[PDB]
Amino acid sequence: RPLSELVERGWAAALEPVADQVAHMGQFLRAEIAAGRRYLPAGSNVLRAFTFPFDNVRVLIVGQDPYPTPGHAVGLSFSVAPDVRPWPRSLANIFDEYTADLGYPLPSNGDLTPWAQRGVLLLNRVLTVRPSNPASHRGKGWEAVTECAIRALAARAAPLVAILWGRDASTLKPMLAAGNCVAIESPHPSPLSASRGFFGSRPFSRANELLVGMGAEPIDWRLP
Ligand SMILES: NC1=NC(=O)NC(=O)C1
Ligand SMILES: [Cl-]
């Protein structure tokens, strides 16, 4: 199916340079199934981050690979379905920072869809994984797709704040360099850094200070 059927209109235009590579990745996933290997998230969720409007993205959160445990990955980085419990460790850590940074009560569930609906792009650099095999689809072709996405956001006239929660943070920074109104949060602790740099990093409040300083609306980070 063409991009226009898979992703939101603005994203379909932004991702046109990787249209053939996206189709190629569809073929890779089919071949995995044919080879007797599984992948996560579900096929219908692989491109889910790009189903919210490109034009309203104001914050980019970048992870590395999807959750490797069956029933966790849902196509938005770090998110889980609202009936998943206990939360994965990374997400529990994210929520302990959420409460500290913002002063909001602990969320009821792990669904980050409200962030996506408000202009937060919950991107992983690699969009699929073989279950129980962490980082197993590294180098299989997603990187050109997600790089295209990142560079497209940075080329927009609009403000953008980037939060780098993956191992490749240092490879990602240059992709964000050309954007005139792009601010990248540094340093780059990841959720599992926990009290050795992640807690107290204030990613949500800092994003909003930066957006407001650039004349953009803040993100409402509140979760139920
Ligand atoms: N634990 C996780 N690490 C990531 O980098 N991304 C995810 O979606 C989940
Ligand atoms: Cl985790």
Ligand 1 centroid distance, CA of 41 (Å): 12
With a 6 Å cutoff on the Cβ, whether 77 touches ligand 1 is yes
Q: Tell me the residue type at 214.
A: M
Does the CB atom of residue 66 touch ligand 1 within 6 A?
yes
Q: What is the b/e burial string over 22-45, where b = at least 16 CB atoms within 10 angstroms of the residue's CB?
A: beebeeebeebeeeeeebbbeeeb
Q: Judge contact between 120 and 62, C-beta under 8 A.
A: no
Residue 190, helix vs strand vs coil: coil
CB contact at 8 A, 126 and 64 = yes
With CA atoms as reference, report the closest residue to 90 among 166, 32, 20, 159.
166
- Cβ atoms of residues 65 and 123 within 8 Å: no
Q: Is the dihedral of CA 39, 110, 142, 44 positive or negative?
A: positive
Task: Give the three-class secondary structure for 122.
Answer: strand
Residue with tokens 């063409």: 2
- 44: domain CATH number is 3.40.470.10
**How many domains is the chain partitioned into structurally?**
1
Sign of CA dihedral 199, 200, 203, 208: positive
Other CB atoms within 10 A of residue 154 CB: 20
> What is the residue range of 54's domain?
1-224
Q: Between helices 203-213 and 89-102, what is the axis angle to 10°?
A: 60
Return the best residue to mutate from 76, 95, 124 for the ligand 1 pocket (most ligand atoms within 8 A of CB). 124
Burial of 6 (0-12, 13-18, 19+ CB in 10 A): buried
Structure obtained using: X-ray
Query: Which residues are bridge partners to 163 per DSSP?
Result: 61
| 20 carries an active-site annotation | no
Q: How far is CA 199 from CA 122, 149, 189, in A?
A: 20, 28, 9
